[PDB]
CSV table of C-alpha atoms and ligand atoms in Angstrom, one decimal:
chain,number,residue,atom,x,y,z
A,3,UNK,CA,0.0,0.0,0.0
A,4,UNK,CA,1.2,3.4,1.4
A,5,UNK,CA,4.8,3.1,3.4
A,6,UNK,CA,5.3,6.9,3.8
A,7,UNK,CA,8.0,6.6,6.9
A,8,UNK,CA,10.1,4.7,4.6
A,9,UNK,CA,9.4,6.6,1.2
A,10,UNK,CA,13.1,8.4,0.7
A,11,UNK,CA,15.0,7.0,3.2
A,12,UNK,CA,18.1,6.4,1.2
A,13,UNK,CA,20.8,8.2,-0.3
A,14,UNK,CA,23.8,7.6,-2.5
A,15,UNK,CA,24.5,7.0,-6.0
A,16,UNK,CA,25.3,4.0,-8.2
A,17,UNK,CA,29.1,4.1,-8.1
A,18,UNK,CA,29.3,4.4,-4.0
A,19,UNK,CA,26.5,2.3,-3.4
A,20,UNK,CA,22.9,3.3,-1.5
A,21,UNK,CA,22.9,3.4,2.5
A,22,UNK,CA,19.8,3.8,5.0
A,23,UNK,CA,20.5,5.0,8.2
A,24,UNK,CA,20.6,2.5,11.3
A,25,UNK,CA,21.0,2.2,15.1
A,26,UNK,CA,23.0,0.0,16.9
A,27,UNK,CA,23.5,-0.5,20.7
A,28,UNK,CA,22.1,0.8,23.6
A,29,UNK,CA,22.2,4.0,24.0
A,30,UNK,CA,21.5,3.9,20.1
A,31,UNK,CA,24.3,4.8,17.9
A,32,UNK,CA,23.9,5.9,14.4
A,33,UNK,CA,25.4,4.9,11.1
A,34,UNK,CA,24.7,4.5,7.4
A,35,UNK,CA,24.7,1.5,6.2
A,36,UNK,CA,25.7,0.0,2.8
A,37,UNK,CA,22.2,-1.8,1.1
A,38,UNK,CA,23.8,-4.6,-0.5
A,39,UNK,CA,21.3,-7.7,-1.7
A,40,UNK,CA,24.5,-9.6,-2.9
A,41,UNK,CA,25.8,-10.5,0.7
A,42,UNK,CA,24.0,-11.6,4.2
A,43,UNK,CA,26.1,-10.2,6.5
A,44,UNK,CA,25.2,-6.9,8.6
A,45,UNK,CA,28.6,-5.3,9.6
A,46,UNK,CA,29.9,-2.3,10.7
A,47,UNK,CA,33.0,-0.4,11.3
A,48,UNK,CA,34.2,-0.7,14.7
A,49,UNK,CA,37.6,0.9,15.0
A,50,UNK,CA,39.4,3.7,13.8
A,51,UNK,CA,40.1,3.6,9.8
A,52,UNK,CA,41.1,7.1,7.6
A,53,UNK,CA,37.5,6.9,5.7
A,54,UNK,CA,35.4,6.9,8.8
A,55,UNK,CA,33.8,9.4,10.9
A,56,UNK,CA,32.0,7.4,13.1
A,57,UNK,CA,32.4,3.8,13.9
A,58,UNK,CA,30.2,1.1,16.6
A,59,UNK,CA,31.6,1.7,20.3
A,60,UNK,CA,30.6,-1.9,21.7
A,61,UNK,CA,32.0,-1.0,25.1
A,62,UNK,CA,29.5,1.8,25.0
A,63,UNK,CA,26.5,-0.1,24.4
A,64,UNK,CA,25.0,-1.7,27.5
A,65,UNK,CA,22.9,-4.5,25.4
A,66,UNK,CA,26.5,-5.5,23.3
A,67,UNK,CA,27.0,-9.6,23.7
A,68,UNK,CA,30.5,-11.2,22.7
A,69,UNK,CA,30.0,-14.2,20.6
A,70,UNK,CA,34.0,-14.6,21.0
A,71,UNK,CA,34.4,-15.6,17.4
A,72,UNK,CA,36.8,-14.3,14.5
A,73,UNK,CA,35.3,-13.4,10.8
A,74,UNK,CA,37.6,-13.2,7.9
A,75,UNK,CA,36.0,-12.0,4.8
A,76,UNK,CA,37.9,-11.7,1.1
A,77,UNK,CA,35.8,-11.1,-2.0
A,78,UNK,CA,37.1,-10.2,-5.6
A,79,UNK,CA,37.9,-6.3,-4.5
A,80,UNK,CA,38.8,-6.0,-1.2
A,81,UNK,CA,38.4,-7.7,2.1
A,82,UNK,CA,37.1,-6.9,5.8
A,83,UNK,CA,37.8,-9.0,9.2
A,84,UNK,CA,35.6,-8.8,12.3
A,85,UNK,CA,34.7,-9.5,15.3
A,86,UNK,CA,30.9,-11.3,16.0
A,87,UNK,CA,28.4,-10.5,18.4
A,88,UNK,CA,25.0,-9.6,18.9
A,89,UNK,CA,23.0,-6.1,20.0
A,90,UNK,CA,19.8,-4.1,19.8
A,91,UNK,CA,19.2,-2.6,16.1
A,92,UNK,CA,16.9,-0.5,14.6
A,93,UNK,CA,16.1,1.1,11.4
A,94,UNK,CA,15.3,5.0,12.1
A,95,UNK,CA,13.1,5.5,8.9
A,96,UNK,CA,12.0,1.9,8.9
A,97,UNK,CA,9.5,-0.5,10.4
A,98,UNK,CA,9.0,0.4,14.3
A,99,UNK,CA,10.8,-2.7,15.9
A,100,UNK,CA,13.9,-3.1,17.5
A,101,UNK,CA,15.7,-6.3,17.1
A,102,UNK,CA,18.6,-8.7,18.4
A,103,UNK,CA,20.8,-9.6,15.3
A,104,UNK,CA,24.2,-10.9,14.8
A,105,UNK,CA,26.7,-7.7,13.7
A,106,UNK,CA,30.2,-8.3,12.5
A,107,UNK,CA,32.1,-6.0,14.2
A,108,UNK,CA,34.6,-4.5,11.3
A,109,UNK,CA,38.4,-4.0,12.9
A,110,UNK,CA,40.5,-4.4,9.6
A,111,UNK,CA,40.0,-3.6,6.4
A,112,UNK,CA,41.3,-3.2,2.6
A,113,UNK,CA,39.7,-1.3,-0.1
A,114,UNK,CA,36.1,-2.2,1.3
A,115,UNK,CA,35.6,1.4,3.2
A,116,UNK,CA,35.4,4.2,0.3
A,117,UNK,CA,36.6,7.7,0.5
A,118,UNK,CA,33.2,9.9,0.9
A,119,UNK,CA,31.0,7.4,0.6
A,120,UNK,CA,28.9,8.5,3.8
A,121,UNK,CA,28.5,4.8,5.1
A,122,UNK,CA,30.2,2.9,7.5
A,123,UNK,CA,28.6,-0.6,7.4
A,124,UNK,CA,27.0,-2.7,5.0
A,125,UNK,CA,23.5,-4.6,5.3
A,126,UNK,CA,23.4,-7.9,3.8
A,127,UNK,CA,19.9,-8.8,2.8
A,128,UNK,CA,20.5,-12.3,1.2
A,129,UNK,CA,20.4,-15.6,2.5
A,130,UNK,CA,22.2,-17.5,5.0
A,131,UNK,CA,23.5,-19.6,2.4
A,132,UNK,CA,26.3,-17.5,1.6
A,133,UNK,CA,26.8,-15.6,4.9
A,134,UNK,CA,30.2,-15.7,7.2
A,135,UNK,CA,32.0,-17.7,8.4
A,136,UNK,CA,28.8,-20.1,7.9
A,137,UNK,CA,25.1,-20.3,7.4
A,138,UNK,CA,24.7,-20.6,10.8
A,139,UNK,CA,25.3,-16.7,11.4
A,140,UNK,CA,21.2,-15.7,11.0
A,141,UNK,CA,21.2,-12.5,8.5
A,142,UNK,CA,19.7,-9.5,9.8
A,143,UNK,CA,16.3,-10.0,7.8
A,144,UNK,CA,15.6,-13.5,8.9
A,145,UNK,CA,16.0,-12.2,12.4
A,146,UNK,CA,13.5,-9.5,11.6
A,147,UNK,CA,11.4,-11.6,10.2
A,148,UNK,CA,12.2,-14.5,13.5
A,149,UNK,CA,11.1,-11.8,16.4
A,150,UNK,CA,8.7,-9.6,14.4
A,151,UNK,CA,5.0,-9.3,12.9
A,152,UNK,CA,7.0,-7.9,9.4
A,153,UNK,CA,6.5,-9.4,6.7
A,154,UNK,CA,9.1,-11.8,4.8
A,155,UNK,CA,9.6,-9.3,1.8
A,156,UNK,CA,11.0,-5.9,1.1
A,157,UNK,CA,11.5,-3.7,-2.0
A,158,UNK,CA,14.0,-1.5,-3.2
A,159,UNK,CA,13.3,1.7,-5.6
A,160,UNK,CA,17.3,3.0,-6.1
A,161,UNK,CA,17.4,6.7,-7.8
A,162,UNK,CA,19.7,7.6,-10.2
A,163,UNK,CA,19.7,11.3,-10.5
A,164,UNK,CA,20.5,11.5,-14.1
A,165,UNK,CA,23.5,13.9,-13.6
A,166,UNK,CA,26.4,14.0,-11.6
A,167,UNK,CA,25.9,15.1,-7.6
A,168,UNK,CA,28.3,16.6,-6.1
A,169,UNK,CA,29.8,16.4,-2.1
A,170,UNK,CA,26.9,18.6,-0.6
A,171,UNK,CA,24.1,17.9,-3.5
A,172,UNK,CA,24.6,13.9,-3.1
A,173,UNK,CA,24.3,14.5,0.9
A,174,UNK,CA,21.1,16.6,0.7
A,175,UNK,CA,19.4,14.3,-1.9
A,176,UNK,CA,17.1,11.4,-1.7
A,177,UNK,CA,19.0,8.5,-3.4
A,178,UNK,CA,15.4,6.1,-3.2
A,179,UNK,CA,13.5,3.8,-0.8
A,180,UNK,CA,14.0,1.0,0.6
A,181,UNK,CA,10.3,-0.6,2.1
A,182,UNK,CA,10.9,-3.4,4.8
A,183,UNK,CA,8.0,-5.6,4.7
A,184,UNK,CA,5.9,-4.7,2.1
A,185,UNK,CA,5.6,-2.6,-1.8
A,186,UNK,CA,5.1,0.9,-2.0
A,187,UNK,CA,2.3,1.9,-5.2
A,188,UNK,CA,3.9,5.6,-5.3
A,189,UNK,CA,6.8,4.3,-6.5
A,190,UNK,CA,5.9,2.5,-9.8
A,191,UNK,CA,3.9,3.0,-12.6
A,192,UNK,CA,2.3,0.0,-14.2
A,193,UNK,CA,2.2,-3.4,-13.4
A,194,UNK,CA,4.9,-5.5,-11.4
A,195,UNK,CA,5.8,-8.7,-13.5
A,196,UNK,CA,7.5,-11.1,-10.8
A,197,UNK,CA,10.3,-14.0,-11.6
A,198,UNK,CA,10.8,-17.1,-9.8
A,199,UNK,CA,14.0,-16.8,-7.4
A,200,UNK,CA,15.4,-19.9,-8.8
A,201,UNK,CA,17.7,-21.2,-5.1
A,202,UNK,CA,17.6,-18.8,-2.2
A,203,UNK,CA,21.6,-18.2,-1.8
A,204,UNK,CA,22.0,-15.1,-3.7
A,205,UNK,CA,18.6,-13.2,-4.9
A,206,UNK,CA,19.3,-15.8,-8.4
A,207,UNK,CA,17.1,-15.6,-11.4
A,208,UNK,CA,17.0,-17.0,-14.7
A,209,UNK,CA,17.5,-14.6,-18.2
A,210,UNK,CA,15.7,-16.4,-21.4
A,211,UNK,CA,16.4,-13.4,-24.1
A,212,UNK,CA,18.2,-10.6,-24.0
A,213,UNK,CA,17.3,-8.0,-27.3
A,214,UNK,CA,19.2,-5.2,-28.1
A,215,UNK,CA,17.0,-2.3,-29.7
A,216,UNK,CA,14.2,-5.5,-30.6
A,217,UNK,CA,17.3,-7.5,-32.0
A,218,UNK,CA,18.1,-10.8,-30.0
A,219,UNK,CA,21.4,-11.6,-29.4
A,220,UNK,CA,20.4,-14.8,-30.6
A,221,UNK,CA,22.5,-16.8,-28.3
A,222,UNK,CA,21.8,-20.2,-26.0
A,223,UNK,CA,19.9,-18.5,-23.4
A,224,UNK,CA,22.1,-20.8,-20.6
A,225,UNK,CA,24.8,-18.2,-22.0
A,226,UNK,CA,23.4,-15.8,-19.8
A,227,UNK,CA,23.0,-17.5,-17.0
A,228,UNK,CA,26.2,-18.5,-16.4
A,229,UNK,CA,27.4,-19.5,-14.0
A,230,UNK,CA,24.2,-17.6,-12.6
A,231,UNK,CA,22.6,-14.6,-12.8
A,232,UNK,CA,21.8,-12.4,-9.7
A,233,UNK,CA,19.9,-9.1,-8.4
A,234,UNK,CA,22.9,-7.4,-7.0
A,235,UNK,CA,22.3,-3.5,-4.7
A,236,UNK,CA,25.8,-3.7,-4.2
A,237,UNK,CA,27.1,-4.0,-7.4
A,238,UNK,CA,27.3,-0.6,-10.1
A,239,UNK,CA,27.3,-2.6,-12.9
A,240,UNK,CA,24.9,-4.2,-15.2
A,241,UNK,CA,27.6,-7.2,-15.6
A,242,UNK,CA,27.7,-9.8,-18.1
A,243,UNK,CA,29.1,-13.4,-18.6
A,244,UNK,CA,32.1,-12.8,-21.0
A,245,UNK,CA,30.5,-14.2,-24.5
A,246,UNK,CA,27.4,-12.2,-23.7
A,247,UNK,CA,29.2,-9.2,-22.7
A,248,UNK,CA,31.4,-9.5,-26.4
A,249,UNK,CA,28.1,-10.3,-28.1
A,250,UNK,CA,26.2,-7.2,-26.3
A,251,UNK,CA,29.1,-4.6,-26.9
A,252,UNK,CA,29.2,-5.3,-30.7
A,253,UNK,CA,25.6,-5.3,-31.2
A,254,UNK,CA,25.6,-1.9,-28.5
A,255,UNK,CA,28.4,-0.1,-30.8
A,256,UNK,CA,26.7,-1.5,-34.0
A,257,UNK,CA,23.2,0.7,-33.5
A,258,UNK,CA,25.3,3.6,-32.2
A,259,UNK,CA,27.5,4.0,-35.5
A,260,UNK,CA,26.6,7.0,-36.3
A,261,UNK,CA,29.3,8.1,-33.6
A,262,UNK,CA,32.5,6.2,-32.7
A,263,UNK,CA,33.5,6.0,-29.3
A,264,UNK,CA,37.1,5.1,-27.8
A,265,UNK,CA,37.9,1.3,-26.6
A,266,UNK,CA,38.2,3.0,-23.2
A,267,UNK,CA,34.7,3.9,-23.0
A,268,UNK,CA,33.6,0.2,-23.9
A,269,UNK,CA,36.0,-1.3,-21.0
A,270,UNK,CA,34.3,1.1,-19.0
A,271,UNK,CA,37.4,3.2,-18.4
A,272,UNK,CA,37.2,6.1,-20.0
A,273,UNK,CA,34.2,9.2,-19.5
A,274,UNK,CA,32.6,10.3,-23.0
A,275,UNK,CA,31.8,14.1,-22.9
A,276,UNK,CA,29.2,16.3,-25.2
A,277,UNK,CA,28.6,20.0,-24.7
A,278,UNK,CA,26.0,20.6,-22.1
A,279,UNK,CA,22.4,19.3,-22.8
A,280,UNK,CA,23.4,17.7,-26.6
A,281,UNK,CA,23.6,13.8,-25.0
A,282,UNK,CA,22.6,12.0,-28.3
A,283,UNK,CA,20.6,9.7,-26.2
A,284,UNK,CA,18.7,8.6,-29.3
A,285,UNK,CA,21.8,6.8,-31.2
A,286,UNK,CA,22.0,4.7,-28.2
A,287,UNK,CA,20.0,1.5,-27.7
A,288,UNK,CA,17.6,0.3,-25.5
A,289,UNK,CA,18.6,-3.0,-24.1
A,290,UNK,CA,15.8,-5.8,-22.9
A,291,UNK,CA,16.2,-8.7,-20.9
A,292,UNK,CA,14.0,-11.8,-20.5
A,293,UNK,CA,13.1,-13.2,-17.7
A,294,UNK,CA,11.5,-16.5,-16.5
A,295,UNK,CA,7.8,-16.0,-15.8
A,296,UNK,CA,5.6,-17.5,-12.7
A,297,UNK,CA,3.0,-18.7,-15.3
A,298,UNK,CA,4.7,-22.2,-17.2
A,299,UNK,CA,5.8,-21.1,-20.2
A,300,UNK,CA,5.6,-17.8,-19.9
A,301,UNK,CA,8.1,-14.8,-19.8
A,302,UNK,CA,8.2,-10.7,-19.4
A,303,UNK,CA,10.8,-8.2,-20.5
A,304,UNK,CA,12.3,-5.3,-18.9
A,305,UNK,CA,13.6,-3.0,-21.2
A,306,UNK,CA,16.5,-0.1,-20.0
A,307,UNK,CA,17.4,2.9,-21.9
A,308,UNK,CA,21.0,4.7,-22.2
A,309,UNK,CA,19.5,6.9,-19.5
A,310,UNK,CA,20.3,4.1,-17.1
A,311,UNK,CA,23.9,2.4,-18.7
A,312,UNK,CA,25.3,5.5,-18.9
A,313,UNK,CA,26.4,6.7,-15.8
A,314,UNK,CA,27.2,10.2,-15.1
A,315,UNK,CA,30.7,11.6,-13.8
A,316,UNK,CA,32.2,14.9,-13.4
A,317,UNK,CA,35.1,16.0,-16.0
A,318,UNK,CA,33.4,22.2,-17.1
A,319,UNK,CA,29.8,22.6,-18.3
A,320,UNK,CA,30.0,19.2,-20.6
A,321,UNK,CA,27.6,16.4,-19.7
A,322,UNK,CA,30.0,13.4,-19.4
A,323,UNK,CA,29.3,9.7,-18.8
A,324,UNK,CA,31.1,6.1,-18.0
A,325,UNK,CA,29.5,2.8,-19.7
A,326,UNK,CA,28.3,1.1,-16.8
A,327,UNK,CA,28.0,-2.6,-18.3
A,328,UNK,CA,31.0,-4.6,-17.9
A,329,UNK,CA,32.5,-7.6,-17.9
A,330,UNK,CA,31.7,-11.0,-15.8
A,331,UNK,CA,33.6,-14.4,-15.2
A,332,UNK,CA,31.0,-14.8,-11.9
A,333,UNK,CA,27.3,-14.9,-14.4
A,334,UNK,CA,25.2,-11.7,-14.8
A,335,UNK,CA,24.9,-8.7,-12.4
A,336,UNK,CA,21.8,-7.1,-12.7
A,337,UNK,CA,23.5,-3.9,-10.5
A,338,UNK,CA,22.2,-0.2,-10.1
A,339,UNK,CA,22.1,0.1,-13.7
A,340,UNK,CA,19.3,-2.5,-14.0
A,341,UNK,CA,17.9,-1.6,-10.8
A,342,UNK,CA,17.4,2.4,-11.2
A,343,UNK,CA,15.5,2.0,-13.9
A,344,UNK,CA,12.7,-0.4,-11.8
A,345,UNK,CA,11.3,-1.0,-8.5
A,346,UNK,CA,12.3,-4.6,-7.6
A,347,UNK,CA,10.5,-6.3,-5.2
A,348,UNK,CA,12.3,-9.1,-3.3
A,349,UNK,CA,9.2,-11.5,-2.2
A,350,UNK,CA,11.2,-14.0,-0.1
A,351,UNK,CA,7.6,-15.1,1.4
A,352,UNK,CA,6.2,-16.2,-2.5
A,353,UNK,CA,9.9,-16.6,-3.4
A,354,UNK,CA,10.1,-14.5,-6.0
A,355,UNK,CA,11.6,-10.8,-7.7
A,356,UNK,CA,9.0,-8.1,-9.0
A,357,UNK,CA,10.2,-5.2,-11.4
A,358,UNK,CA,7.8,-2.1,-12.2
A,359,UNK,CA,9.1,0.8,-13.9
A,360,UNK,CA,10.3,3.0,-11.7
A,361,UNK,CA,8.6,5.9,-10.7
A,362,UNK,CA,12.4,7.9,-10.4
A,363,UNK,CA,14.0,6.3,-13.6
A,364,UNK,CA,15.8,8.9,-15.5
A,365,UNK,CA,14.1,8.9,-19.6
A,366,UNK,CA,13.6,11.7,-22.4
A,367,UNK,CA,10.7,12.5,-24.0
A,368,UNK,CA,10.7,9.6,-26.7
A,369,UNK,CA,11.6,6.6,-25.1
A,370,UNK,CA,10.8,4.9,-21.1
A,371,UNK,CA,11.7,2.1,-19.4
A,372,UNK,CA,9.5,-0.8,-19.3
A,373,UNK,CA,7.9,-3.7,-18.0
A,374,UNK,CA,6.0,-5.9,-19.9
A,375,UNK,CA,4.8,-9.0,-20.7
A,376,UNK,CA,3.3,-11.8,-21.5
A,377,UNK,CA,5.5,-13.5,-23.5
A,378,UNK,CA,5.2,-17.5,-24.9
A,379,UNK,CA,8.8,-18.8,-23.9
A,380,UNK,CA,9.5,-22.5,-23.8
A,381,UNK,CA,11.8,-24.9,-21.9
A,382,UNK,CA,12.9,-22.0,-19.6
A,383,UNK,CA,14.4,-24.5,-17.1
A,384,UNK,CA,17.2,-25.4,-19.6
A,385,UNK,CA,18.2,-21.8,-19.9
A,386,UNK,CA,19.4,-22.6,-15.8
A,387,UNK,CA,23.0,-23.7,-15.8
A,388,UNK,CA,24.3,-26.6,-13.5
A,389,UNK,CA,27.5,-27.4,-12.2
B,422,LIG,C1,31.6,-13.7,-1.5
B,422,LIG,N1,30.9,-13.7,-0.2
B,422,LIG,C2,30.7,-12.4,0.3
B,422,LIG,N2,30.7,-11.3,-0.4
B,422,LIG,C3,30.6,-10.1,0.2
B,422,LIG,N3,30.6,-9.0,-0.6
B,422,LIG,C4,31.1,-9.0,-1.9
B,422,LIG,C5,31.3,-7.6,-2.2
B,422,LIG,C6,31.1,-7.4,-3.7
B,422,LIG,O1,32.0,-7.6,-4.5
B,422,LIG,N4,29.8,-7.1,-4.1
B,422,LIG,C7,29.6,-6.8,-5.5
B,422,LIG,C8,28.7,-7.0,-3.3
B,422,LIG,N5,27.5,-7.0,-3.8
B,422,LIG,N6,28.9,-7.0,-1.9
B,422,LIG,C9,30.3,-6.8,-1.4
B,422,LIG,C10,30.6,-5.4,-1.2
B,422,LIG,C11,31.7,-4.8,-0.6
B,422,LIG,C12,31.7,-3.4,-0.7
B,422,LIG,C13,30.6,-2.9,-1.4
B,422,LIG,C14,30.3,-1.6,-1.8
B,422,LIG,N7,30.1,-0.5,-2.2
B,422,LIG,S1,29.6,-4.2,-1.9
B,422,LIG,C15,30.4,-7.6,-0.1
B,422,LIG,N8,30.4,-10.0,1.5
B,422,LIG,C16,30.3,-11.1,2.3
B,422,LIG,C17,30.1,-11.0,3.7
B,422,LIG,C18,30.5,-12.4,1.7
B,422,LIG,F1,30.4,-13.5,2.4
């Protein structure tokens, strides 16, 4: 229905990520937190590091428990270690409850903590599959869920504002919503079309076409699914498995001919510039994926303009951009890119993803985003990879 204390209660931008503000301890101490649905871990920063202006002070929280147990996380880009334990959290502009969950209390790091980001933990909304050091560490929304009347679902509308922000602008803007326990109507227009979350580890889905300006790629859709594909907050990207991502770029630079771009812009590198307001928007394509319906046999499409793989970055008055699809040898990455274009609702109850258009997606006057379906699609299992 109608979520107003949680309309607007994020901020960021694609590149840093999108945080909501949350308390921990007792008396309550306040950070922003990293949104990320591509981890399950809720951790914070709990000592002193260069990036940080505030961090969790366990000795100053009378509810803090010691679970007396190490964490050592490395991923691809950086890594964080920890300390576990347990304390009273709550979300300021969020449901009114106050839980006991599991945080990770952050005491090293490298190159996970970024340089005016705002945020100083991170909010790992997937499943206890793939949290750490096991799945026996509960995730923060299953312990919602656990000790709660909120329901098993939340939904994320991320806002790309279309133009670079700058220190100030990106700290007085609303960067989206995030709605814990249930789907906000102001935030869409048209129908939600949902997928099936194929195994409930990462938020995993299944592709079945991608088209680039109504042209399929034409490729065996368990190309794009592997090794999986996944709805991914934390992620800037729309990523894609290697031989899709070589397939999409030369279809992408194909209907944008009319203008040649450097190979730095295609590996994502390099910014492209034009003179303020002249974005040729229009020689770009729009790109549609394909996903697995809940109906056998049946699929929808979501469709994303320029307006959403560009990504805008400071240089002067120019209107500059990075390509924001990359990329993968880890499956597809539906990131910000995808996501700021729709309103995705993660239905963990019904185990499955809905996408609207986004009430806040960036378009011109000729073209939108879209939702829309149905679509006859057959033998959608085999486009899942195994193994
Ligand atoms: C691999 N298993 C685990 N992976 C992760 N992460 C992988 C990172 C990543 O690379 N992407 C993309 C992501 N979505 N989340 C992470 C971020 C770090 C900084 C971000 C920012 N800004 S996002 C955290 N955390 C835990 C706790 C795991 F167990």
């Amino acid at each position: 229905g109608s979520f107003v204390e949680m309309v607007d209660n994020l901020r960021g931008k694609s590149g840093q990520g999108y945080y909501v503000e949350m308390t921990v301890g007792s008396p309550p101490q306040t950070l922003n937190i990293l949104v990320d649905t591509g981890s399950s871990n809720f951790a914070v920063g709990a000592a002193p590091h260069p990036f940080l202006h505030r961090y969790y002070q366990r000795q100053l929280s009378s509810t803090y428990r010691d679970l007396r147990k190490g964490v050592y996380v490395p991923y691809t880009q950086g890594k964080w270690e920890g300390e576990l334990g347990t304390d009273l959290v709550s979300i300021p502009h969020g449901p009114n409850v106050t839980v006991r969950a599991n945080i990770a209390a952050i005491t090293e790091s490298d190159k996970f903590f970024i340089n005016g980001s705002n945020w100083e933990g991170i909010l790992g909304l997937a499943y206890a599959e793939i949290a750490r050091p096991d799945d026996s560490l509960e995730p923060f929304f299953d312990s919602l869920v656990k000790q709660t009347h909120v329901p098993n679902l939340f939904s994320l509308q991320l806002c790309g504002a279309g133009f670079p922000l700058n220190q100030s602008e990106v700290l007085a803007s609303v960067g989206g919503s995030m709605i814990i326990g249930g789907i906000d109507h102001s935030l869409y227009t048209g129908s939600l079309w949902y997928t099936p979350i194929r195994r409930e580890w990462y938020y995993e889905v299944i592709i079945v076409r991608v088209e680039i300006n109504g042209q399929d790629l034409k490729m065996d859709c368990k190309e794009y699914n592997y090794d999986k594909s996944i709805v991914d907050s934390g992620t800037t990207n729309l990523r894609l498995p290697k031989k899709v991502f070589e397939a999409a770029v030369k279809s992408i630079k194909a209907a944008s001919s009319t203008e040649k771009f450097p190979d730095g812009f295609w590996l994502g590198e390099q910014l492209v510039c034009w003179q303020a307001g002249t974005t040729p928007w229009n020689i770009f394509p729009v790109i549609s994926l394909y996903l697995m319906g809940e109906v056998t046999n049946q699929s929808f499409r979501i469709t994303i303009l320029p307006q959403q793989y560009l990504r805008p970055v400071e240089d002067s008055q120019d209107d500059c951009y990075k390509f924001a699809i990359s990329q993968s040898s880890t499956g597809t990455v539906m990131g910000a890119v995808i996501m700021e274009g729709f309103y995705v609702v993660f239905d963990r109850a019904r185990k499955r993803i809905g996408f609207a258009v986004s009430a806040c997606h960036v378009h011109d006057e000729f073209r939108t985003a879209a939702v829309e379906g149905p679509f006859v699609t057959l033998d959608m299992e085999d486009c899942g990879y195994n193994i």
